[PDB]
Amino acid sequence: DEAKISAQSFYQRLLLLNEEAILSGQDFGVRIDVDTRRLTFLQLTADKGWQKWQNDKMTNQTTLKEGLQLDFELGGGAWQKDDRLFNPGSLFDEPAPQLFVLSSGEVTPFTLSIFPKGQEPDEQWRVTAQENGTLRLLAPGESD
């Protein structure tokens, strides 16, 4: 529910980014930082490479509220987050995105899972870009 809202947020942002790429002919991307529970929305630029997308449609970085976690898998791969409660180097207060959102409309196949702390990522609230191109929001327990 806090997880649901967060999943909807990401789904809305991803669809808008996909739309922007198609409309503008520019390439975009999403960087997932599992240790800081952050999602960053990036634009590829010739002069500066990947940068946070400065825009008048949506914020370009979101961080999950306390009590929620996230994890991700790329295509058919394993979940990316390790089992540590915290990364002792990350505690202290652009890197390229793992998800490319291209102007052709193609999106890197992936699954992002958002969930309460204490739980595993499997079959949680999920947003996925399927091998066939479809973007989907999945509820907990929902297949595929």
113 token code pair: 């899972």
Q: Is the dihedral of CA 57, 63, 69, 74 positive or negative?
A: positive
Category of 53 on φ-ψ map: left (φ > 0), alpha (ψ -120 to 50) or beta: beta
Question: Please, which residues have CB within 8 angstroms of residue 77's CB and are 6 or more apart in sequence?
Answer: none
Question: Please, which residues have CB within 8 angstroms of residue 37's CB and are 6 or more apart in sequence?
Answer: 63, 64, 68, 69, 70
The domain tally of the chain equals 1
Q: Which of 4, 32, 113, 19 is nearest to 58 (CA)?
A: 19
Domain of residue 120, CATH code? 3.55.40.10
Q: Given in angstroms, what resolution was this structure solved at?
A: 2.0
Print the domain residue range for 38. Answer: 1-144
Q: Which of 66, 92, 73 is nearest to 32 (CA)?
A: 73
* HSE-up of residue 65 (Cα within 13 Å, Cβ side): 8
